[PDB]
Amino acid sequence: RKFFVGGNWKMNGDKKSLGELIHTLNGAKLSADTEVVCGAPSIYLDFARQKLDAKIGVAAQNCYKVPKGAFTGEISPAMIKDIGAAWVILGHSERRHVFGESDELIGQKVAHALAEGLGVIACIGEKLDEREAGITEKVVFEQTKAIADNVKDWSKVVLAYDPVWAIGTGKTATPQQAQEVHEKLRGWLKTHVSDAVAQSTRIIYGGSVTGGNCKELASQHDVDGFLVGGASLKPEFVDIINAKH
Amino acid sequence: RKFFVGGNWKMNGDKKSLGELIHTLNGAKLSADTEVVCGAPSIYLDFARQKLDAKIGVAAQNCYKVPKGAFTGEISPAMIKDIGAAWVILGHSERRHVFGESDELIGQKVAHALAEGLGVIACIGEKLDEREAGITEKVVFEQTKAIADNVKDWSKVVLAYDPVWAIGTGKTATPQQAQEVHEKLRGWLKTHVSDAVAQSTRIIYGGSVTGGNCKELASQHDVDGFLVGGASLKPEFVDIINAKH
Secondary structure, rough: OEEEEEEEOEEOEEEHHHHHHHHHHHOOOOOOOOOEEEEEOOOOHHHHHHHOOOOEEEEEEEOOOOOOOOOOOOOOOHHHHOOOOOEEOOHOOOOOOOOOOOOOHHHHHHHHHHOOOEEEEEEEEEOOHHHOOOHHHHHHHHHHHHOOOOOOOOHEEEEEEEEEEHOOOOOOHHHHHHHHHHHHHHHHHHHHHHHHHHHEEEEEEOOOOOOHHHHHHHHHOOOOOOEEOOOHOOOOOHHHHOOOO | OEEEEEOOOOOOOOOHHHEEEEEEHHHHHOOOOEEEEEEEEEHHHHHHHHHOOOEEEEOOOOOOOOOOOOOOOOOHHHHHHHHOEEEEOOOOOOOHHHHOHHHHHHHHHHHHHHHHOEEEEEEOOOOOHHHOOOOOOHHHHHHHHHHHOOOOOHHHHHEEEOOOOOOOOOOOOOOOHHHHHHHHHHHHHHHHHHHHHHHHHEEEOOOOOOOHHHHHHOOOOOOOOEEOOOOHOOOOHHHHOOOOO
C-alpha cells in the first residue's frame, strides 16, 4: 500500500500565502514513495492545480451529489474534474458536525463522485463521549458501512480515520489507539467486502498530526498515511510526507 | 435608485460554457443605467473576474462568518475579496431550505461580509404554504428583521424578494403581487430603519424572471431590478438587463 499524505488546508489562505506554501512544496525533497494530495478552498482549486507540480494531486474539500442544478453555493464533481483536480474529501468531521451532513447524504456524494471519476478521501471518526462510552467500534463501522454500501470500485477510495476529539485539539491519538482502530477497520473491510479490498485500501489517520509525532504513528502496521490539518499549512508538512525516512 | 440585475448561475457551467456566456455579455450592449452582477460557482470566481469586463461585478454564491479556521468546504469574505469579487449572495432559498441555514446564521454572515467590505445581496421570501396561509408579511418581515439587526451601513445591501414558490418553477409572481411585497418591505425599512434607508435601498425581485416577463415587472414603482437564475445562463439575460429600455 503506497503511503498517502493528504493536506487539508480547510478555510485558510489567500493567493500570496498559498503561493509561497506551494513554492516550498514544489522545491522540497519529497519521498518518491509517498502519494501527496493538497485539499484547497474551492475558490483556489484552479490556482492550486495551476501552481503545484503535476506529481502532487489536488482535492476539493467537498462537493454535491448531482452534476448541475439549482444548488446555490455548491460545486459538483464535473466542475472539480474540469479544473484538473482528481480527488474530493467527503464526510469530514466539520461537514458532519458543523454543517449537519448525514451519513445518507455522504454516501450519495461518494457514489456520485466515484461515478464521475474522482478519487474520494472518506472520513469517519467517533466523538469523545462515544469513545468513553466504549462504542468507538459501533460508531466507525456504522459510518464505514454507509460509505461502503455506495462504493462500486475501491481502487480510488482512501479511508480516513479522524477521531473528532483529536482534530485541532493537540490531543493526538497514541500510536496504539490509532493502530487499534485501523486494524479493526481493515478487519471490517475483509469480512464485509473482500480480502483483496482489505489489503489494498489505504486507511490514513488524521487529528493533530505534526512533524514531531508522525514517525511513531507511521511505523504502525495498519497506518497508511495521514490527513493533515493545521500542519499542512507549514513547512513541517514536508517532514510529514517523509515520515518513513 | 439604480436598477440592479444579478444573475445567479447556481451550480452550472464549466470553463468552456462560462467563457462562452462571458464573451456574450462582454460584447453585448448593456444599459449604462443598470448595475449588473454575475454570481459564479466558487470554483470559477477567479476565472469569471478575470474574463468579465470591469463594469460587470462578480458575486460569490455564499460565504462563512469568520475570516479563517477549521471549516472544511467553506470560503470567507477575505477570500472573495482576494479574488476581486465585490459581492456575496446570502440567505438564498436553496441555502435555507436544502442546506438548512438559519436566520441567525444568515445574519452572522451578513454582519461579517459587510465588516469585510463586500456588498451583500440578501434573499428573503415565503413558501407556497405560507402565501396560501396568508402570512406572507409575517414571514418576510421576520426574515428582514434578522438581516436588518446585522446591518450597520445599508449602502452596500440589496434586498432580494425571492418567493420560494416562484424559484425555478416557471410560476412568476404577477407584477401586482411583487409590487405589493416590495412596497410593504420599503415601508418596514422606513419605520424600522429610516426614511433615507427606505428611499435608497434597492429591492429586487427573483423567481422565474424571463425576457418575456421582465418589462411589465420592471414597470412597478418599487421593483428595483431582478435576481435571475435559469435565464442568467441564456442570451435573454441581456434583455433582462435592458428591461427598462
